[PDB]
Design a protein around this motif. Sequence first.
Motif, PDB file in Angstrom:
ATOM      1  N   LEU A   1      -4.728  -3.075  -3.715  1.00  0.00           N
ATOM      2  CA  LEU A   1      -5.815  -2.255  -4.235  1.00  0.00           C
ATOM      3  C   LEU A   1      -6.621  -1.645  -3.093  1.00  0.00           C
TER       4      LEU A   1
ATOM      5  N   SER B   1      -0.239  -6.721  -5.815  1.00  0.00           N
ATOM      6  CA  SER B   1      -0.477  -5.284  -5.879  1.00  0.00           C
ATOM      7  C   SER B   1      -0.525  -4.645  -4.498  1.00  0.00           C
ATOM      8  N   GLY B   2      -0.880  -5.414  -3.467  1.00  0.00           N
ATOM      9  CA  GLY B   2      -0.955  -4.853  -2.129  1.00  0.00           C
ATOM     10  C   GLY B   2       0.386  -4.359  -1.625  1.00  0.00           C
TER      11      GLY B   2
ATOM     12  N   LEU C   1       2.985   3.989  -0.874  1.00  0.00           N
ATOM     13  CA  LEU C   1       2.484   4.810   0.221  1.00  0.00           C
ATOM     14  C   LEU C   1       3.571   5.114   1.243  1.00  0.00           C
TER      15      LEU C   1
ATOM     16  N   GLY D   1      -5.382  -1.079  -0.077  1.00  0.00           N
ATOM     17  CA  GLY D   1      -4.544  -0.192   0.713  1.00  0.00           C
ATOM     18  C   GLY D   1      -4.697   1.264   0.319  1.00  0.00           C
ATOM     19  N   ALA D   2      -4.724   1.538  -0.986  1.00  0.00           N
ATOM     20  CA  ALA D   2      -4.883   2.914  -1.444  1.00  0.00           C
ATOM     21  C   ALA D   2      -6.295   3.428  -1.186  1.00  0.00           C
TER      22      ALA D   2
ATOM     23  N   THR E   1      -8.110   2.572   1.427  1.00  0.00           N
ATOM     24  CA  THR E   1      -8.064   2.926   2.840  1.00  0.00           C
ATOM     25  C   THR E   1      -7.298   4.224   3.052  1.00  0.00           C
ATOM     26  N   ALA E   2      -6.201   4.411   2.314  1.00  0.00           N
ATOM     27  CA  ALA E   2      -5.419   5.635   2.441  1.00  0.00           C
ATOM     28  C   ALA E   2      -6.243   6.862   2.076  1.00  0.00           C
TER      29      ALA E   2
ATOM     30  N   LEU F   1      -8.954   7.512   4.773  1.00  0.00           N
ATOM     31  CA  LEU F   1      -8.349   8.095   5.964  1.00  0.00           C
ATOM     32  C   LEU F   1      -7.917   9.537   5.731  1.00  0.00           C
TER      33      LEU F   1
ATOM     34  N   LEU G   1      -5.870  -2.852   4.041  1.00  0.00           N
ATOM     35  CA  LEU G   1      -6.461  -3.503   5.203  1.00  0.00           C
ATOM     36  C   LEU G   1      -5.639  -3.217   6.455  1.00  0.00           C
TER      37      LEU G   1
ATOM     38  N   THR H   1       1.411  -1.198  -3.508  1.00  0.00           N
ATOM     39  CA  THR H   1       0.734  -0.043  -2.932  1.00  0.00           C
ATOM     40  C   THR H   1       1.349   0.339  -1.594  1.00  0.00           C
TER      41      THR H   1
END
Lengths: 36, 132, 132, 96, 132, 132, 132
Positions: G1, E2-3, E10, G3-4, G6-7, G10, F1, E6
């Motif tokens: 999971l 899933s990373g 993004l 990453g979003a 953190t998005a 930010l 991350l 994402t």
Amino acid sequence: LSGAVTALILVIASVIIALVVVGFAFGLFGAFTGQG
Amino acid sequence: LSGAVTALILVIASVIIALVVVGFAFGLFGAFTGQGTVAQVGTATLSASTLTLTVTLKNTGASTQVTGVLINGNSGSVSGMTTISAGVNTYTITISIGSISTTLRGLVGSTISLTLILSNGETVTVSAIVTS
Amino acid sequence: LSGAVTALILVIASVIIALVVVGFAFGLFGAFTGQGTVAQVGTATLSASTLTLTVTLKNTGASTQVTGVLINGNSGSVSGMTTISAGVNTYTITISIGSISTTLRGLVGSTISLTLILSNGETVTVSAIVTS
Amino acid sequence: TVAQVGTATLSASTLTLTVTLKNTGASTQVTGVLINGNSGSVSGMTTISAGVNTYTITISIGSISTTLRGLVGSTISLTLILSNGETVTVSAIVTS
Amino acid sequence: LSGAVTALILVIASVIIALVVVGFAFGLFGAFTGQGTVAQVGTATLSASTLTLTVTLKNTGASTQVTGVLINGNSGSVSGMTTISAGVNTYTITISIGSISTTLRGLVGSTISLTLILSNGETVTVSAIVTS
Amino acid sequence: LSGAVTALILVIASVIIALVVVGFAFGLFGAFTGQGTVAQVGTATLSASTLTLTVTLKNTGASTQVTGVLINGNSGSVSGMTTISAGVNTYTITISIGSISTTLRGLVGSTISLTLILSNGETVTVSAIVTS
Amino acid sequence: LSGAVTALILVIASVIIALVVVGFAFGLFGAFTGQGTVAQVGTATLSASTLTLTVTLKNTGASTQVTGVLINGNSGSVSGMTTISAGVNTYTITISIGSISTTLRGLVGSTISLTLILSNGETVTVSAIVTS
């Protein structure tokens, strides 16, 4: 990105204002030459 | 991963825009330097009977036109040699005003001041001698 | 188990990309600092008979060229000493325009303004004295 | 990891790129270059060793030749395609 | 697993947004370049009896309007030829002020300064000669 | 991350670059403040027989040089005391021109205007009395 | 999971910071617009015997103070009506300098120029008539 946008807006405004001032000065010259 | 992509896209766009602005500024400089400078380089002659203005004008810039003239009472049109080339040349310009005609017959031998309206937005002050 | 693998791969890729972007930005800074700055450091001389421009120019950046010149009426080409080295030097540049020739003979002793177009996209405004 | 650590020089007459590149990983190659109009090949010092070194790379493009003669003294942006699938953005000064 | 999904989502969203922002900035540049530049290119005439202003205005941008005028004492409305087309044209504008009327009868032959308020938020300073 | 890693790397790089730009701007300010200001603080003397210029110059900035001089007809070189120190000092400068020599013998007792070209790109206008 | 997550964190932080910066800029605009503008709106009077300056000053901004004065030879202190309120008012300010005293007795009837140092970092140039 916004800095260059501001720079161009200011440049355009400065050009417009300088042209207005120059035109006003030349109109003053014409008015004073033939005042009577 | 997307943050650095956005950073590079924004950096490239900012560089492009800054180059465009700098080029436009330098083009403005070049355009304003040689826009056309018109001045008088000698005494003009304004005939009273024929209402003809003979003036020596100096143009150290781009070639402009003579849109109109401003004499004492009224502003009239011009009907001859209205194109002002670069350098120093003598221009014979005919002035047509309904009212100012025959008013200069009593001013023969006197001095007079005129204004020339150009196509580049610049007004030239001209000193002349009224003749017959 | 795959999530942390993906996290490390993305972290490494993001670090590589960020380093690339930072290096490109610093290279842009270095390139823009020394792109070439040309200015005038004295009165120039514009001969009317030979149409030769003798101008002292100062270059505090990279060596550029002279692509063209802009005089009062028309923009012409340049046919001599078009390379502008770093420092302050006197350049003898010959200007070739079909129409502007012989127009400066009536301007001897007067002042004139020119524009020099360079290969780095910068226009230099030059003030000169018309001679013979 | 390949990045730029200084301003590069792009000759217009000889079409030679002198760029200082930093490699903090395994040694890669330079498969090609991407200049303004077309992407051409590279014919010199294509091996990028670890550390910071200056590489003199010759670029051969049929069409881009002589187009840079009017850009002497200006800034330019390039892209270097490497053998590890990474593209390096290079800023240079056009010289003669 | 899933990373990376994402990360790609993004990245795509960031690219779309950056393109939108860049397009908006360039549209802003185009809109501001041709917003409308109005200046004076000759002496105007301000009649005292009829309170009529005859002014030659130059517009090198988009067509604007004349929302109002500002004369010495009060700011009044305008009731004629309020549309300013591109180029250089002569506009005959009638000024209606309750108080400034008949105040210019003692100023015949003198110079005067006006201000023209335009629909693009720009004020134009106009120099005129008071006539009868 | 990886997004926050990229964010911190970009923040650090932006801070470094902003500090570099600010330092460069302040260095520019310091360099331009004390670049060298040369003016005249008294009447100069221009000998006609020896073609020697004795001028009192004031320098309130960095020490510059005298690259050349511009007299009525031609611009010649300078061959003495060309270094202009800070403060007010009297400089005896010898001018060598092939043509302007002996032309000043008929101007003894008259006033004259000169121009001094400096190494910092600044021209100084000098008024002198022609002597013998 | 992550990453979003953190998005979004930010994005929220960037929005907060941008709003803070915009608010600070607008507050700077408001503070600089009304910082205090002091000028002279009439001829001042400088007594020679009592060394008292009577000057009419106009303040179109915030209320400032008079930290000191600068007269011909030395800069002295001020000991009266040092608060400059908004509007146009006449201020009677007493100047105390050890050396400049009795030097103005030979300047009665002459004009003089002063400088007023304000608490907002602005210097006001004042022209006065020396009286007794």
